[PDB]
Write a protein that binds this ligand. Sequence first.
Ligand SMILES: O[C@@H]1[C@@H](O)[C@H](O[C@@H]2CO[C@@H](O[C@@H]3CO[C@@H](O)[C@H](O)[C@H]3O)[C@H](O)[C@H]2O)OC[C@H]1O
Length: 189
Amino acid sequence: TIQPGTGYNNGYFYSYWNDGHGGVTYTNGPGGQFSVNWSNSGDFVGGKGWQPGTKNKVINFSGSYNPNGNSYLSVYGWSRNPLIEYYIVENFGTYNPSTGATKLGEVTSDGSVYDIYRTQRVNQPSIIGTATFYQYWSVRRNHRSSGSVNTANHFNAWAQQGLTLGTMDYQIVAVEGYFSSGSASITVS
Ligand SMILES: O[C@@H]1[C@@H](O)[C@H](O[C@@H]2CO[C@@H](O[C@@H]3CO[C@@H](O)[C@H](O)[C@H]3O)[C@H](O)[C@H]2O)OC[C@H]1O
């Protein structure tokens, strides 16, 4: 278990962030493994991967993901210039994060169709400070907690649609929660 922060563990970058409300623990395990256990949490994100990510990584993940309430399991990361927060959502809990969002197309990858969306965060926290920035989403129709994500298929479809990415910052497989409960154990490579 670690303080919220970033660093490296067993060859993998990790990021663990929370809002200080309590109710969530994040643990780094061997190799690319991490666990999250939460019960009436606040807002949080944690997981393992790479710093920087790339635009053609094939990301493999496997494990168990058991949210009770609002949570996502995604390939998650940022670009700079432009500042973008992006998600390739493989599974979620009570809330589909694209609800009410503008649909920007579809892409087929790794055994499922994904729906593509763009949203905007206004004066919200980010990797560079408070900012207004777009988020890009691919939301998998057929939910799962193991698989392979060919990120190029998503990034290329986004680019085709005008959702351009700048220089990649970190890129992880993340469990995100917003005032929920759950458990998860995920191994990345
Ligand atoms: O110390 C600073 C860190 O706190 C900072 O981390 C990023 C802050 O932005 C976080 O993203 C939110 C996650 O939840 C989504 O729903 C929101 O739109 C995001 O804003 C991100 O996960 C952290 O990496 O990094 C910069 C450091 O200076």
